[PDB]
Amino acid sequence: ISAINWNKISDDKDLEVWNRLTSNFWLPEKVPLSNDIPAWQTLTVVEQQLTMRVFTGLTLLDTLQNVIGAPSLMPDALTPHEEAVLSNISFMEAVHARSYSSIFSTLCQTKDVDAAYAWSEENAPLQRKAQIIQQHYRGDDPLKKKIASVFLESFLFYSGFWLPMYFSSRGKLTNTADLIRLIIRDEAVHGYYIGYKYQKNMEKISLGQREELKSFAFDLLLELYDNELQYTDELYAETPWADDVKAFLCYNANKALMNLGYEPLFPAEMAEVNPAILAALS
Amino acid sequence: ISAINWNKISDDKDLEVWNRLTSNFWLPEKVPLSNDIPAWQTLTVVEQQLTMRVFTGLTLLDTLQNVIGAPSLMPDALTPHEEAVLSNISFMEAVHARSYSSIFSTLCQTKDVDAAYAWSEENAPLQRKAQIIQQHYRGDDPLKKKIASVFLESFLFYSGFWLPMYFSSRGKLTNTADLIRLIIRDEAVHGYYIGYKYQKNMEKISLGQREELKSFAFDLLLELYDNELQYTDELYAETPWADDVKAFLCYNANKALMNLGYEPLFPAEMAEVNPAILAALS
Ligand SMILES: [Fe+2]
Ligand SMILES: [Fe+2]
Ligand SMILES: [Fe+2]
Ligand SMILES: [Fe+2]
């Protein structure tokens, strides 16, 4: 163990991402969530239940990435500066997870929040995606860990992120949406950075293993995608939104792939996102 | 793995410390370090060398706590909220380590900084304290890890922290001192919190083991203390400050012990700190 030296950077990307993530620091207390109480009251009981179920699912994934995901990447870091960036990523995942509790406390009845947590424990597609990602994090293959991480950061959140963006486009839960945009601002850099590191590590490996990994990445994404369609159907069943969410999934699946340096899987016909959703995202 | 719930806190202390540490977030870029350039020029070559050697030693310890220390406590957490607090502690240790590079870049010549890093790699007392703490972090005894951590956070930094506080009392390197005060503001809470958790865990163990641990804590502190006197002699040899630093060590050793719930080891005669140092600390 040696004292880290930030004036001897071996990969400029490490410093760029360190700077981006740390200068994007936020806490849920900085968002005036309580201003969403009136809009919350205008939602139907079905819409309110959907929101709490969505948010507990996102909490699980952030908790996973904090406790297991980002720490699992640490032994595989190329530089000590990357190790430090990973410590920031792990901490900001805890901030993400915590922020869902801030929303629940501000807007929701505890009996309903507890029901949503229980629903998430029993939800098959949610538990399946958590299981699949965990298996790779706990595995011995550092490159498969990074693929799974990018799929978590750049794809697996987005069936959930869709909803506050939709509400935002309707002028509802705009403060919650501002908070979610802060989470997304982090996740997008996380997926980009880990994807970048995947590609850097791939430079060292054989032509055969590169092909095995590309095939693995596509098969895994297809499996997570199929599972995510089921998760979406079970969440969004009493709404007319399932098709919109699905297109949003395809759109973000293509971004996850590009972060790993791969071509899009889903054609434009499947990844067409309503301009109001895109606008709310910005 | 379950989604964390911050509205079901099992120990209020976890939320208190989460809030304290996150609301104390800072980065070295927030401190106008470049305003210290004039004062830096007024220091002697011997004083400048001392400063760089001191700071590399502190960098090593922060790096240790980031990479090994705080993560080593995670498996022993009593609550999921403590796990999250530990993620923040680990990240802020990386910020601490990074900030020494910010100082070096702003104030120092690279040839001199590199010499100081090399000196730290070869310094026997510095490598010994790093070794002793690491051994406990890598051990199987969760309670001894916490003792070692509190000694790192509340004692082992302070032979180094003395110097910028001294300069500050003389109206020199006041911005660097402001930065160091931010580091200390974190370390003091870290030592308090981990010490609190040590005591919480001690509630569960036998009367015999409590006595074995108290004896171990005192013996370890005495060993680190003896080593730290040697480290101090080797750092401060060409100055008249060694006695002042030593008293500061005794003062902080007593605080480390109180964080673990133990009585002071060092009498007032040994722990008398010059009022100007104390004032600079506030
Ligand atoms: Fe997250
Ligand atoms: Fe993330
Ligand atoms: Fe530190
Ligand atoms: Fe610390």
Side-chain angles (χ1 to χ4, degrees), chain A residues 62 93 96 153 157 183 187:
Chain A
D62 285 316
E93 295 299 328
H96 300 173
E153 304 271 15
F157 287 122
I183 291 174
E187 310 304 11

Short mmCIF file of all heavy atoms in Angstrom, two decimals, chain A residues 62 93 96 153 157 183 187, ligand 1:
data_model
loop_
_atom_site.label_atom_id
_atom_site.label_comp_id
_atom_site.label_asym_id
_atom_site.label_seq_id
_atom_site.Cartn_x
_atom_site.Cartn_y
_atom_site.Cartn_z
N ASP A 62 -30.22 0.14 -6.37
CA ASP A 62 -29.20 1.04 -5.81
C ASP A 62 -28.50 0.43 -4.60
O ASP A 62 -27.28 0.57 -4.44
CB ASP A 62 -29.79 2.39 -5.42
CG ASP A 62 -30.07 3.26 -6.63
OD1 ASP A 62 -29.22 3.34 -7.54
OD2 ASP A 62 -31.15 3.90 -6.66
N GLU A 93 -24.38 5.64 -4.79
CA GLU A 93 -25.44 4.62 -4.80
C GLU A 93 -26.21 4.57 -3.48
O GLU A 93 -27.44 4.39 -3.47
CB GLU A 93 -24.88 3.23 -5.10
CG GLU A 93 -24.28 3.08 -6.48
CD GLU A 93 -25.29 3.32 -7.59
OE1 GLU A 93 -26.50 3.02 -7.42
OE2 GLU A 93 -24.86 3.78 -8.66
N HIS A 96 -28.44 7.53 -3.61
CA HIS A 96 -29.60 7.17 -4.45
C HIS A 96 -30.63 6.37 -3.66
O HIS A 96 -31.80 6.77 -3.59
CB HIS A 96 -29.20 6.38 -5.71
CG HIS A 96 -28.27 7.12 -6.61
ND1 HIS A 96 -27.68 6.53 -7.71
CD2 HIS A 96 -27.81 8.40 -6.59
CE1 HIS A 96 -26.90 7.40 -8.32
NE2 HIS A 96 -26.96 8.54 -7.65
N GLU A 153 -26.60 -0.18 -14.67
CA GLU A 153 -26.55 1.29 -14.68
C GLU A 153 -27.25 1.95 -15.86
O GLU A 153 -27.81 3.04 -15.72
CB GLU A 153 -25.09 1.78 -14.65
CG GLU A 153 -24.23 1.26 -13.46
CD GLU A 153 -24.29 2.16 -12.24
OE1 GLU A 153 -25.20 3.02 -12.18
OE2 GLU A 153 -23.43 2.04 -11.33
N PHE A 157 -32.58 0.18 -14.60
CA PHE A 157 -33.32 1.21 -13.85
C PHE A 157 -34.47 1.82 -14.65
O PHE A 157 -35.38 2.43 -14.08
CB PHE A 157 -32.41 2.39 -13.48
CG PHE A 157 -31.41 2.10 -12.38
CD1 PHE A 157 -30.04 2.26 -12.62
CD2 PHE A 157 -31.83 1.76 -11.10
CE1 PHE A 157 -29.10 2.02 -11.61
CE2 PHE A 157 -30.89 1.53 -10.08
CZ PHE A 157 -29.54 1.65 -10.34
N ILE A 183 -30.27 11.46 -10.01
CA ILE A 183 -29.87 10.05 -9.99
C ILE A 183 -29.39 9.64 -11.38
O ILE A 183 -28.32 9.04 -11.53
CB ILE A 183 -31.00 9.12 -9.48
CG1 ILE A 183 -31.26 9.35 -7.99
CG2 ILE A 183 -30.67 7.63 -9.72
CD1 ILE A 183 -32.47 8.57 -7.46
N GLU A 187 -26.01 7.84 -12.80
CA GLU A 187 -26.04 6.52 -13.46
C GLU A 187 -25.46 6.56 -14.88
O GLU A 187 -24.77 5.63 -15.28
CB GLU A 187 -27.44 5.90 -13.50
CG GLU A 187 -28.22 5.85 -12.17
CD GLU A 187 -27.51 5.14 -11.02
OE1 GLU A 187 -26.32 4.81 -11.11
OE2 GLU A 187 -28.17 4.91 -10.00
FE FE C 1 -27.94 4.53 -8.29
#
